[PDB]
């Protein structure tokens, strides 16, 4: 369930280098 940015989860490998999803991602990725 992605809310708002369900990233940062350190160890896991986010998905922000194809297409953003996360209304409200705060990764460096996409500022
Ligand atoms: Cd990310
Ligand atoms: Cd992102
Ligand atoms: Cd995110």
Request: net charge positive.
């Amino acid at each position: 369930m992605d809310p708002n940015c369900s990233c940062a989860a350190a160890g896991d490998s986010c998905t922000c280098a194809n297409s953003c999803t996360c209304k409200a991602c705060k990764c460096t990725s996409c500022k």
